[PDB]
Amino acid sequence: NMMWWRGGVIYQIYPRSFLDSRGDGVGDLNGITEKLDYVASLNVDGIWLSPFFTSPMLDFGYDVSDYRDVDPMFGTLEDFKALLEKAHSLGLKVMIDQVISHTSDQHPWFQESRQNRTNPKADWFVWADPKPDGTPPNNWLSIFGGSAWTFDSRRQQYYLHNFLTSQPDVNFHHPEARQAQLDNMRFWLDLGVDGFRLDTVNFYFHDAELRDNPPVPKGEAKTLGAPEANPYTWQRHVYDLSRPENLDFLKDLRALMDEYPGTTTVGQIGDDNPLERMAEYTAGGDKLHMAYTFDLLNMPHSASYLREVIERFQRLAGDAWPCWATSNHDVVRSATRWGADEDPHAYPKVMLAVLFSLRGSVCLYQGEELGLPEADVPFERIQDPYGKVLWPEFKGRDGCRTPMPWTDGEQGGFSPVEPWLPMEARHLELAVSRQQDDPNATLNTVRALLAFRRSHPALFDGDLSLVDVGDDLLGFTRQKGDETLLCVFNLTGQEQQTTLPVEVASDLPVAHFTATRDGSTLTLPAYQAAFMQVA
Numbered sequence: 001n002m003m004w005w006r007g008g009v010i011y012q013i014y015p016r017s018f019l020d021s022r023g024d025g026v027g028d029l030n031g032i033t034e035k036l037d038y039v040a041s042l043n044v045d046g047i048w049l050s051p052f053f054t055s056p057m058l059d060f061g062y063d064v065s066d067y068r069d070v071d072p073m074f075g076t077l078e079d080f081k082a083l084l085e086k087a088h089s090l091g092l093k094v095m096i097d098q099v100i101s102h103t104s105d106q107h108p109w110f111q112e113s114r115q116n117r118t119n120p121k122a123d124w125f126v127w128a129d130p131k132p133d134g135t136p137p138n139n140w141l142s143i144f145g146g147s148a149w150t151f152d153s154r155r156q157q158y159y160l161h162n163f164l165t166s167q168p169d170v171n172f173h174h175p176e177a178r179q180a181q182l183d184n185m186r187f188w189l190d191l192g193v194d195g196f197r198l199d200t201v202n203f204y205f206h207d208a209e210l211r212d213n214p215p216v217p218k219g220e221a222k223t224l225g226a227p228e229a230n231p232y233t234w235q236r237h238v239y240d241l242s243r244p245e246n247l248d249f250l251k252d253l254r255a256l257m258d259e260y261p262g263t264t265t266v267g268q269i270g271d272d273n274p275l276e277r278m279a280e281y282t283a284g285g286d287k288l289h290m291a292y293t294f295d296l297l298n299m300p301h302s303a304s305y306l307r308e309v310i311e312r313f314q315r316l317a318g319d320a321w322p323c324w325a326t327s328n329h330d331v332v333r334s335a336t337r338w339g340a341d342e343d344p345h346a347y348p349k350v351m352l353a354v355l356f357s358l359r360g361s362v363c364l365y366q367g368e369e370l371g372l373p374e375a376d377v378p379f380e381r382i383q384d385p386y387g388k389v390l391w392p393e394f395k396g397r398d399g400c401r402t403p404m405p406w407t408d409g410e411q412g413g414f415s416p417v418e419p420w421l422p423m424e425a426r427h428l429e430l431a432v433s434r435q436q437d438d439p440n441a442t443l444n445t446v447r448a449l450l451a452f453r454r455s456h457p458a459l460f461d462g463d464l465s466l467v468d469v470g471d472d473l474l475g476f477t478r479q480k481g482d483e484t485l486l487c488v489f490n491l492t493g494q495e496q497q498t499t500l501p502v503e504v505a506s507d508l509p510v511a512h513f514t515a516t517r518d519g520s521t522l523t524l525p526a527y528q529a530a531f532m533q534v535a
Ligand SMILES: OC[C@H]1O[C@H](O[C@H]2[C@H](O)[C@@H](O)[C@@H](O)O[C@@H]2CO)[C@H](O)[C@@H](O)[C@@H]1O
Pocket: 059, 062, 063, 099, 143, 163, 199, 200, 224, 225, 226, 268, 269, 270, 271, 329, 330, 386
């Protein structure tokens, strides 16, 4: 089945916070290998591993110094091969992150590049002369704070970095660099991986003319890939990323992926118009297989908003394929980000039902199946550098990166010592051991939802058609050939009622969800979901 990815569910693993098996407080590959049975018990189709490659860990993995090796803190290449084999033996696909838009400054490429203007790798990165007054070439801002340019005295030149200063951006306008990254991907492809999560996929190319970005009109909706307090949201990003040439490169990338049947790619979109960019990137069947945005990774979460997102995406290319995610290593956990003012146990269930019922692929973040809320990390335990620039208006991403609670024992059974990030007390209450045999628990709801999803083709890659179910409900039909399912969701803490826009043949029960269908009237209690078979 070469089309497993088109509708499949992927479980994201953040290597540093999954399981420590070496007793150093940091998660490693062998721990993941140890918990692959649990992962498979989740009824997911595969996994996505955040960067485990050689890195100074300034951005904790996303600042790579060696693309073709495992950082000794996570383990070895052989350990990864073992992980891959065990995951394959359990029927799990293995996707790994690929951070090719920027390297660490400790990467040999940049170490050679920064020496002068004539060295073999001088144009592998984005270098530019200062303005006559000595200031950066343009008004481009780094997401992690300050200018996107940093002066280097060896070359008398600013280098570009959309993120950390220790994360210089790769110059994709230089062909040999692009090809170098392609080969770096071919390495892992030859190892036998099942796919790649493409980090900052729309960031690859920049405007070679280094043109200034226009400011954002005051009172307009800021970009969804950054907090409000970030000055990065003050300007419209048109020249610093999302260049036309990128499309071409995508094709190239796709071609590489096409050399290995069964493989797939999911790109991370960070753009002013994310749905349009995703649809543009995943259409044609000759570029990205799929991609995800920040549309479901932000604050709005009502049925009206979800309807708006779906409508906005359906406006675009019909041959595009979205991947939907409500949580990851960059945002506040959905149980808190979306359901802070909702029921702690009831809301995540129906939210996950919605996520699993959307047309497209799914990214399920580690712990989200347990309904884990965001952890409040104290200032002296902050690890993420992004949490030290906008404090206290923005405290970084460490809250969603606290270690996985396997038991309610010491350190959640994550480590025999104090972990790199502290263990959340609330997470101990929602630990796997406490949750493994609880029928009312979120974990079993996830298992049942995914099993139910697996048993219905319409819920894999069927068409989605919105129906009028009212303001405070989310209703649509999923249709694939023989099957047509009516899906209605109540995301509120109140009982909702509606008249069925279509006629129903039967009810489809799943995971203790309860709704009453009397005549033409469907009634859903708080945080309940209703699946039905359309006549
Ligand atoms: O590797 C740097 C950074 O990139 C990714 O996230 C970015 C995203 O691409 C941007 O659009 C924007 O939203 O900033 C994000 C980081 O806050 C990675 O997912 C992230 O882990 C990494 O730090």
